[PDB]
Design a protein around this ligand. Sequence first.
Ligand SMILES: *[C@@H]1O[C@H](CO[C@@H]2O[C@@H](C)[C@@H](O)[C@@H](O)[C@@H]2O)[C@@H](O[C@@H]2O[C@H](CO)[C@@H](O)[C@H](O)[C@H]2NC(C)=O)[C@H](O)[C@H]1NC(C)=O
Ligand SMILES: *[C@@H]1O[C@H](CO[C@@H]2O[C@@H](C)[C@@H](O)[C@@H](O)[C@@H]2O)[C@@H](O[C@@H]2O[C@H](CO)[C@@H](O)[C@H](O)[C@H]2NC(C)=O)[C@H](O)[C@H]1NC(C)=O
Ligand code: H0L
Ligand code: H0L
Lengths: 530, 530
Amino acid sequence: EDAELLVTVRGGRLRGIRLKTPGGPVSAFLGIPFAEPPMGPRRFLPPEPKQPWSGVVDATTFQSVCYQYVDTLYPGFEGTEMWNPNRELSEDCLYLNVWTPYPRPTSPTPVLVWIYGGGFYSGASSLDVYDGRFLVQAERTVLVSMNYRVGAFGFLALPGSREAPGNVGLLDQRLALQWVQENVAAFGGDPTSVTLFGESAGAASVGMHLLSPPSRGLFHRAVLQSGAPNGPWATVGMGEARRRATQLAHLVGCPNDTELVACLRTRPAQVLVNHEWHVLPQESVFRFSFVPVVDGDFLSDTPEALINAGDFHGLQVLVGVVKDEGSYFLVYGAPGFSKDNESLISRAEFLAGVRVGVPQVSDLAAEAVVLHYTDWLHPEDPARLREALSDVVGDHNVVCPVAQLAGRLAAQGARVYAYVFEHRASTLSWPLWMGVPHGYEIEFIFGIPLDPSRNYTAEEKIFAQRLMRYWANFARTGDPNEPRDPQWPPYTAGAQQYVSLDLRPLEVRRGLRAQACAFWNRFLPKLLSA
Amino acid sequence: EDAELLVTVRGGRLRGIRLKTPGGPVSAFLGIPFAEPPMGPRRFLPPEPKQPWSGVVDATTFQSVCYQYVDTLYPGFEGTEMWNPNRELSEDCLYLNVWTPYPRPTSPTPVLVWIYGGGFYSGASSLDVYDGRFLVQAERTVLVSMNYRVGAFGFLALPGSREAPGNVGLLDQRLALQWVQENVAAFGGDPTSVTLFGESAGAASVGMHLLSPPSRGLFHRAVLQSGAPNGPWATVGMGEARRRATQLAHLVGCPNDTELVACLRTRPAQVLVNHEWHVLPQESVFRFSFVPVVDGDFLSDTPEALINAGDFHGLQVLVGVVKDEGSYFLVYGAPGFSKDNESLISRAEFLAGVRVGVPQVSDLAAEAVVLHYTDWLHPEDPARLREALSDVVGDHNVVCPVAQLAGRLAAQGARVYAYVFEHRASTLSWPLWMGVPHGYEIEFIFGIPLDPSRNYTAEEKIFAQRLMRYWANFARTGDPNEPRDPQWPPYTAGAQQYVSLDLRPLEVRRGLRAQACAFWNRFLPKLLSA
Ligand SMILES: *[C@@H]1O[C@H](CO[C@@H]2O[C@@H](C)[C@@H](O)[C@@H](O)[C@@H]2O)[C@@H](O[C@@H]2O[C@H](CO)[C@@H](O)[C@H](O)[C@H]2NC(C)=O)[C@H](O)[C@H]1NC(C)=O
Ligand SMILES: *[C@@H]1O[C@H](CO[C@@H]2O[C@@H](C)[C@@H](O)[C@@H](O)[C@@H]2O)[C@@H](O[C@@H]2O[C@H](CO)[C@@H](O)[C@H](O)[C@H]2NC(C)=O)[C@H](O)[C@H]1NC(C)=O
Ligand SMILES: COc1cc2c(cc1OC)C(=O)[C@@H](CC1(F)CCN(Cc3ccc(F)cc3)CC1)C2
Ligand SMILES: COc1cc2c(cc1OC)C(=O)[C@@H](CC1(F)CCN(Cc3ccc(F)cc3)CC1)C2
């Protein structure tokens, strides 16, 4: 038996596995239970901590994926399948993973905690693109990732009730982070240097832990990739949460919050999943049925208010976006869009798409959108209309929420670093008109190009090694810059400096789509209030 | 005596005067009465035709200027004085002027009719910059210009009343146009080829005669320089016109519409002038107290509405703007602005000037303006704020009203030619930061640079000759282009082509500030409706 692969945590004994990486071995502890299985009576309830165990738990493979909708848009296509569950669906899914250097470290080592995205309705820590062996070998960090409940199981809310309080998926994340505090030192990690990082709904989750004091004590630095808690899709108010929950109950035959929830627990998990997308109020893209709710508990106020009122002195943050944030969303419901043609839309299709991409705003608001994104010297040109809609959806849902957060955090005490990710993977299977889509920087951060069985160029492998170095430098020191050596300047509300990440060296640019984001972050809220 | 200078018109006999130009003489008939003096009980009433006279009317000098406010902003400054009255003020001011080649054409000559600008509150046909001797000698047209009542005398309106109906200054213009129909042949002019042309409020007047059927039979072609009848300053509604007339009465000590106008008719003219600016509802620039009223008579509906519903087949129109339409207005009440320093305003001055330059709009509409005119990469930069506010005032009041008129007329059967005048006169006395200000193309249209006592360059004189040729070509044929010879394309709603007028040959461009005018012409009305 290998004693490097044996670890005891507060719950009992764990056995792990030695993983092989191109650069050397890595210890991996995959599928560590951290909660009691949230099944039967425990469906929709906050997670309870895992009760201690006798013997040795084999933590040698990824455990099950939390129940979730499975994308069927382009069946068998690499671009959609890479995000789909690669383990059995189950409600017994609250397990986390630890990767640590081999042999395990002797000096307390900085920890990176990954939170996957997937719109709060999908995702898993077992996806090939979140493999943590490459980052742990190259940068000698400890890496943790967890599963958390998604869809109705994680975020269905009857606000006020005991039986479905909402936000339990965020409580899964919080419990995983408490486990890191009590136990990561057993793997050689340092619980006083913990960096959260996540992408899309994971980035929004990282942001909500920033704004929730019981979580804020569990980490020290944050990375938000292509997401923010103030995004128009990442939260919902108490009333709309109850309307959606009640419509789901009605659609699956269920009738007092206690009795409605009790009838919901008798339904098969798949029956809930099959009716998830039917509770959305309007035809839309980038809108999800069950998301965090503002109930005054995890979030005291809306994220926009908590951001504006926060003191962030002592925090370091790294934030960024990809170059084409909204392209991927259009093939999921905007008129005239396909991955299999050039999606050169007409003007009527553009106007129609604006209401799908900016759902639940007034006709006047929609007209201000059409004003700002039409080129009035070329109002009919299909190629311009295509990127215009892509920019609408990307600015509204990602770029401008992120820029608002970065700007407030910097002005209110935090050190912020910002990037735009601009390299299109040579292996990307989506059409060329989509540019660099939402989610395609993650493989480079996790060093997936260093896997030999994949067919990345040698330059992409060097780029991966640069990006892992920035991320781990930030995790270690709060600063992505190489301690003794092209500098990455802090982002500030005045100068608004950020860097481009591609095969070329760092180039400093100014303004995260500043004219566009002035519309979304300043004017549109005022129009909605009048 | 000279038989060339004796002319008989319907009302009697006139004696003219020979005038010299560097290219030869010109016959001038100045101060021809075309209406009964609108004095005493005729104040505020429509003009009525001049009764015939015996003997010979002396037509060798300009007659009086209609009572008007005299600009005292920079006393003795050439830039302001060139627009101030250069004859005595009198209510007895309804005279017109005819300039014709010497000796008089014996065959019908196309007629240009000039309507002066001045905000409907000022102006005079005798100003040096409107001297018709140069256009008449070089282009061999007949030039007519007339005085019309301004300020309260021309546009004070108690709508529906018999004693102050409104729009009588426009009726003075119509009467002069009828005079031209009946009498211009006596000078060699062809009453079947009359081109109206005007600048600023004169351009708005031209547009108003386009949209009024009783006027529309008195001319055939139209030139609108830096003005349009749909300008936010060019008309007032009945309610606000009544409010303004009522407050003027109060401010001059007057108390029933009949009783109110009677007391105003007892007041010296200069008394009415002294209180004119005080009836304006808000602190403003480019806003005038007594302007045309929409009452259902001269204008059946608002000009914007009559434009959208018109059949303009058969109409040729020449329209254009100067390069910096708003600069001049800022020295009359925008915070931080002076002709004597660089007017490098601060952000707070910029925000306050938006409310003076866009008066009487909601705060939400003002935010929208600040959105679109701030550079969010440089929100504090004084030079950028100076130009931005100049663009706000110029786009709101001139460029975008003019672009709307051009697009509607073109798309509804008119043949439209559009220009931007981009030459800054070498003799200009205003500071360099105002660029090419409002009004400073007129002197080139009238060929003032040909006068040797003025200090224009040689190739400014050539420029002037080019523009006189364009204007006169258009008067003769509806097309400014040289009939047998760099082509000036028509402006269309699609291609939006226009030319730049400067010392360089014609350069064709696309779109009169198309992005900015989408805001003012498309979005901002929808915002004010909700
Ligand atoms: C681009 O494709 C979309 C989507 O059409 C689907 O994918 C195509 C590759 C082809 O296989 C179609 O048959 C598929 O339905 C086109 O938009 C569709 O157009 C059809 C008319 O043929 C219409 O019935 C659908 O409702 C449209 N779908 C959407 C989402 O709008 C679009 O016209 C194509 N653009 C081109 C060819 O330029
Ligand atoms: C540019 O000048 C304006 C106008 O000030 C007037 O003209 C100047 C040339 C000078 O003679 C001033 O004394 C005149 O009053 C300045 O704006 C004024 O600033 C003063 C303060 O000194 C203030 O009392 C006035 O209210 C301001 N007037 C307006 C219309 O805002 C402006 O500051 C000057 N810009 C500079 C110097 O950059
Ligand atoms: C069934 O109906 C609908 C399904 C979807 C929508 C709308 C629907 O109906 C209106 C959407 O908007 C789709 C949103 C997507 F995000 C698009 C791209 N990701 C990839 C990805 C990126 C980053 C990740 F971290 C994880 C995954 C997949 C889903 C799904
Ligand atoms: C006393 O108070 C005020 C006085 C004025 C305003 C506001 C006032 O108080 C709020 C203004 O907006 C001024 C507007 C101006 F048009 C600017 C341009 N010049 C030259 C010019 C150009 C073209 C012409 F055809 C004729 C003349 C005339 C004055 C006057």
